[PDB]
Each structure stands twice: as C-alpha cells, then as structure tokens.
Amino acid sequence: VLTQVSSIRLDQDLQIAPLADGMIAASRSGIVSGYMGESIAWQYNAEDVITGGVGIDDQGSVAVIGTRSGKLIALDARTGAARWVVELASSSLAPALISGDKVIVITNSGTIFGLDINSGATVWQYATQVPNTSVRGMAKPLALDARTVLIGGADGRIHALDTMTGAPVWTRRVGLAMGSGEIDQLRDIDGTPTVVDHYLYAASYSGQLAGFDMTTGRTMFVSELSSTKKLTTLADAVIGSSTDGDVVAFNRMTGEKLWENHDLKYRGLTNPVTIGTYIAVGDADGVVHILNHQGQIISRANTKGALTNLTVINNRLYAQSADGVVTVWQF
C-alpha cells in the first residue's frame, strides 16, 4: 500500500509542515529546517526547546513555532528568516493555526491567543478553564470558516470563537468529568476536531466521541471512545485511536459501532489517518499499520523511533519520530 519515498534525519508531538516542493520540520532541540526535495534550503535555530509546531499557512508561505519558554516565532517559509518573535504568557504543545490575518495559538494556561500575522502582536485572548491536572498535550486550533475557529479545550468542551475578536460564538460539551478527583476530572479534547461538510466530530480523554450537525446545532450521537488523537473519516465511518491502543470505527451519522480492532492494544498509537480507501496508524515501536475499511490489518511499514502523529497531504503520508527521523511514503 505504501512505498517509502524519503527517510531524513533532522539536524539537532511535533508535526511536519509539507510544502508543494518539500517540507518544513523542527527538531525538539531547536533547529527548524526547510527542505526542498531532500536537500536543506534553510535552517533556523530557535535557541530553545521547540514544544509547538510546525504550523504553516495553507499557502505555504509562513511557518510558526512555539518554544518551551513561551516564545512564538513566525518564519518566512521560503527563506527561513524570522518575521517576528514574541513572548506569550504561556507555551504551546500544538502547532499554531494560520487563518486570514491571524495566528491562533492554544497554550498550557488555557488561554487561546489570537496574534496578528504581520507583527505577532496579541490582538485577542480567550481563557478556557483547565483542571489542576490535565492530559499532557493539546489540540491544534481549526478554521471552521473565514470567521470561526474551533478550539478543543482541556475542559472537554469545543469552543467556537470569532476569528477577528476572540469572542465565543458557541460551545459544546464533549468530555465529561466523573467527579472532583484529579483522575476523575481528566476530560481533554486534545485531538483537533474533525470537520466533514457541515458535520463535526470530536472525542475526549474521558471517553465521549460526539457527532454534531453544525447546520442545526443538534447533537447527532455520542459514542464511547477515550482518545487524545485526531479522528479521521472514511466514507460514512468516523475512526479514532483509543488510549488503550484500540482502533475503532463508528457510523458518522448515527454513532453505531462499525468495527473495532484490538491487535495493537497498549502500543501507544498515533492518530489514525485515511490513505485512499485504507487507514494508517502508527505506534511507539515505529510501526505504521495499514487497515482495510473493515478494520483488518493487511500491512506494516517499519521506521526508527516512536511515532505520535501522522500527517496526510495530497498523496503522501508523513511521519516524524521522537528520534528526530522524518519518513515519507506515497500511496
């Protein structure tokens, strides 16, 4: 199903930012490399541990990284030159979203920051509530349309914000606390919600996967799936990876269970991704498993290093390991 196309060691949960003729990848040690094909076009040293990235506009022209110390840096995607460097009151563990003239950042404090794309100035802030202990990591903000951004919160809610002002447009509860204790409160939506047409899906650490009809604002279903990873869709199936290492599929209109694969239990799975008519999910041994649409494993590609995130862009599957290895496959 997959043929290896590249295997690159990065100079020393970060995501690759694919470009039309290459890619941008950051090492957690601080080096952001812009690649043209398999050769380095540029490098930028952040002089700090990179905790969030690589964010990229849909036009492939500006890249964003967040550092452990709360710095947020915008880079020209072609040259690697910094456009601006600002310091926020909190660090980010997810890539920044670029929408319109805004860079939108989720942070440890629960604050969502709306930044001016040209200067990095803070235009707006939106505070979400965060339990004293929450699940480590966060969801990348998502542009619903030109005027609405969707935030997955540590409070288990989806927050819909006006892109220009930061004001809340609406919210929905997905993750549910089971009490006041530190374990019982854990309910993060740490996987970026999934939009297909006017339908919205999100899952949560506490075990709820909700499907929403954004046209009516109605809840279509709530099913059982504890997850910290982005969901994927395949025709009428919505599919996710559980915190137990299950891969499970639901009907994305009714919420009924389609299939559930237990072969990868406890392996530490990435988000599952859709590759054509197949599904791919990676694990902590560096193995990417390929599933058919009936949830049966038919193939396995192996890389070096633990995987936590898979990215599909056009025809290629991108994986960045914790060992700093970036692997690309085509399908």
Ligand SMILES: [Ca+2]
């Ligand atoms: Ca979290």
Ligand SMILES: [Mg+2]
């Ligand atoms: Mg998380």
Ligand code: NA
């Ligand atoms: Na990266």
Ligand code: NA
């Ligand atoms: Na690098």
Ligand code: NA
């Ligand atoms: Na982005």
Ligand code: NA
């Ligand atoms: Na962010």
Ligand code: NA
């Ligand atoms: Na609803």
Ligand code: NA
């Ligand atoms: Na998932």
